């Protein structure tokens, strides 16, 4: 069946704006999609939300390709904080 790039990019454009408002609940994440979006067809209004939920079930498991928000900085800071004979002769030849 697959999904079209129009709905894929419409699903990507959202999330980044109010991830602090998006939450775990599937129904809530559905409702906020029309609450925030502008799509006129209700079939999209739930079809894109399906993929949005499919995207957030990929978080807290690995990289999810996007979303540069307040949650990519704590990880960055936490993650931040004799020899081979020819080469010994090189050292001795140079000084």
């Amino acid at each position: 069946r697959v999904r079209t790039k129009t709905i894929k990019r419409a699903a990507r454009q959202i999330v980044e704006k109010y991830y602090a408002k998006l939450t775990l609940d599937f129904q809530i994440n559905k409702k906020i999609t029309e609450e925030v979006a502008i799509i006129p067809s209700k079939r999209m209004k739930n079809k894109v939300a399906g993929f949005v939920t499919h995207l957030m079930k990929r978080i807290q498991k690995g990289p999810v390709r996007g979303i540069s928000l307040k949650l990519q900085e704590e990880e960055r800071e936490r993650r931040l904080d004799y020899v081979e004979p020819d080469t010994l002769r090189m050292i001795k030849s140079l000084g």
Binding site: L80, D86, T87, M90, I91, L94
Partner: protein
């Protein structure tokens, strides 16, 4: 001087791969009995201190870009760009940004720095369309097409690349007035190293 020498020995720049090549006989000294070549390190030092010496000559550093198509060169080039004023792109290089003036990114430089000519030969190809000189960290087998200042080092070792970019940044800082030559440094190579 002595400490600055001491802080680069422990790394693995000196080892360079097989494929002796031709235009790097000056930089290689002897191939090991096992068949792995070794770089002089008595030429790498001044090649670095001269590549930085031409980098600083760029009036606004943001006009220099640094490229690395490998993961363990990424953190190095991003950190070098962040610490100095130049800027870097890492990972995949979209093959239009130096000749295609229409694309959303574009942003051509005045100076190009290359982690590996063989790996990101696309950028080295594009430089010759827009008069970009190009410095490159050239391993013992790297091609020298469209390169002028070849820094002879190791291009596959994570620590080697990280140290090379770290002390290139160190030299381009010494060369300006940011901090003097005398004092030892504080920023450690693992701060540059791939995680």
């Amino acid at each position: 001087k002595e400490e600055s020498i001491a802080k680069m020995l422990i790394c693995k720049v000196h080892i360079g791969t097989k494929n002796l090549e031709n235009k790097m006989k000056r930089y290689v000294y002897t191939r090991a009995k096992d068949g792995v070549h070794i770089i002089n390190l008595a030429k790498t030092y001044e090649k670095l201190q001269l590549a930085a010496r031409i980098i600083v000559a760029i009036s606004n550093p943001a006009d220099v870009v640094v490229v690395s198509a490998r993961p363990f060169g990424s953190r190095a080039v991003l950190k070098f760009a962040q610490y100095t004023g130049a800027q870097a792109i890492a990972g995949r290089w979209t093959p239009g940004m130096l000749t295609n003036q229409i694309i959303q990114k574009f942003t051509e430089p005045r100076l190009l720095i290359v982690t590996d000519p063989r790996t990101d030969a696309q950028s080295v190809k594009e430089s010759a369309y827009a008069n970009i000189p190009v410095i490159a960290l050239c391993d013992s087998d790297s091609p020298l097409e469209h390169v002028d200042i070849a820094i002879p080092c190791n291009n596959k070792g994570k620590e080697s690349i990280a140290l090379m970019y770290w002390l290139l940044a160190q030299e381009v800082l010494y060369l300006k007035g940011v901090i003097p030559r005398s004092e030892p440094w504080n920023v450690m190579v693992d701060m540059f190293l791939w995680r």
